[PDB]
Enzyme design. Sequence first.
Site, PDB file in Angstrom:
ATOM      1  N   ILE A  67       0.870  -1.073  -0.021  1.00 37.25           N
ATOM      2  CA  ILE A  67      -0.030   0.070   0.038  1.00 37.25           C
ATOM      3  C   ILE A  67       0.779   1.216   0.082  1.00 37.25           C
ATOM      4  CG2 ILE A  67      -0.428   0.013   2.565  1.00 37.25           C
ATOM      5  CD1 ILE A  67      -2.978   0.917  -0.184  1.00 37.25           C
ATOM      6  N   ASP A  68       1.793   1.434   0.922  1.00 40.88           N
ATOM      7  CA  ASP A  68       2.700   2.538   0.883  1.00 40.88           C
ATOM      8  C   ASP A  68       3.923   2.152   1.353  1.00 40.88           C
ATOM      9  OD1 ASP A  68       2.053   2.322   3.606  1.00 40.88           O
ATOM     10  OD2 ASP A  68       1.964   4.436   3.978  1.00 40.88           O
ATOM     11  N   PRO A  69       5.052   2.905   1.340  1.00 36.92           N
ATOM     12  CA  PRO A  69       6.363   2.513   1.773  1.00 36.92           C
ATOM     13  C   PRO A  69       6.501   2.374   3.482  1.00 36.92           C
ATOM     14  CG  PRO A  69       6.444   4.603   0.304  1.00 36.92           C
ATOM     15  CD  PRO A  69       5.049   4.246   1.081  1.00 36.92           C
ATOM     16  N   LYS A 131       0.020   5.351   5.584  1.00 33.60           N
ATOM     17  CA  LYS A 131      -1.159   5.675   4.819  1.00 33.60           C
ATOM     18  C   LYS A 131      -1.634   7.211   4.893  1.00 33.60           C
ATOM     19  CE  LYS A 131      -3.073   1.808   6.151  1.00 33.60           C
ATOM     20  NZ  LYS A 131      -4.185   1.009   6.628  1.00 33.60           N
TER      21      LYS A 131
END
Lengths: 218, 218
Positions: A67-69, A131
């Site tokens: 989803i994100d780093p 997020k």
Amino acid sequence: MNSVTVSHAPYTITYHNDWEPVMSQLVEFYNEVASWLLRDETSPIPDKFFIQLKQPLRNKRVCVCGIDPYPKDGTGVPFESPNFTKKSIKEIASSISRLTGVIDYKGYNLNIIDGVIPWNYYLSCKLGETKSHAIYWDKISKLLLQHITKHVSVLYCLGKTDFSNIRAKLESPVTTIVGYHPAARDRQFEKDRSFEIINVLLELDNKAPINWAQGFIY
Amino acid sequence: MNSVTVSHAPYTITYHNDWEPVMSQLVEFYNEVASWLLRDETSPIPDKFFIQLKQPLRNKRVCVCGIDPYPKDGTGVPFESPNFTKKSIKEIASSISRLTGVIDYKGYNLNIIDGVIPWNYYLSCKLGETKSHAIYWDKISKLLLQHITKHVSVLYCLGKTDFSNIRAKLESPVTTIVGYHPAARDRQFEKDRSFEIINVLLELDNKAPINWAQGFIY
């Protein structure tokens, strides 16, 4: 080898020619949004936001997407942990260990496997907050992943809740597996068999399987 | 277990309760199309259009799907041939024969296999003409197949060009194999290994494998 210029930092986005059809809208969307994400200390640092666009797509056949780093120490390469300290990549390595038979390894990288592109849906987050940069990447994230799904054969998203509806509202008929996140309750990623499922799906689409053992570092 | 009424033939539709959430829309969609269908001699005969709706859904994990019923002698049960005369089913039987090793048999029925629902996408055709009732069944076919995919874990479609873009409008997380049609040229279905691959996918999804030899008639 090309690069277009934005007006907020990193000011320059150097990209592989496979990303050309998208680079135009990326500049438009980024200039509208950058000032919000640059307010905080980010993971990764802004000079690394887009270094994954240096990766060719033509040769890729599977996309492994989170989803994100990482909340901290994002390197600009999705999933990458140079010193093999991050949990997700450590857990991914363990599954591939039990699948391939390789037990002696010092690290693992998805960025060195033929036919595989590791990807972050959102390209940054406020340091230590997962997020946090969702609404800012929203349009860009949809834009970029759609382009990836035009090249790859199978999309493998990690996180049931994370990629809840996003995969459906992506608007592509690409074969997708939404498996558990490495951090899931009751050892659900350990029971998860997606890497095996990918190779079976690839054979159906007349594509060579992924040599998952290639990610290992010795 | 229940029954609903329609303004045109077959006038009454008996359905298993697992179909309930879809029966309301079926009556509506059928009433606005039936006249197009009953205009021709159809395969199967109108009294047999929906006899497959008496099959339960919860206990089914595999759907084996063809585009429409046999040009002639359709029974209402997809793929079925009482006297084992149809090319599609004989080729299917030969494929199962070469896998399981069973050599002596008189017939084969996909309807009598646990966890398998044989399905015709379009529920009728003008007698002799394949795909002739496609646009008339469109809305209904999409409606019914989507309800099926909410239960099964692997959708097996036979026919490459037939199910090309009927896969593209997936709108379902279901694993989809689009294999060769049993009547394909140059022995492509004979070389086709989808029947084996189904059980491999079922084993990966943690579901009971399909015992295909149950389909045989002695």
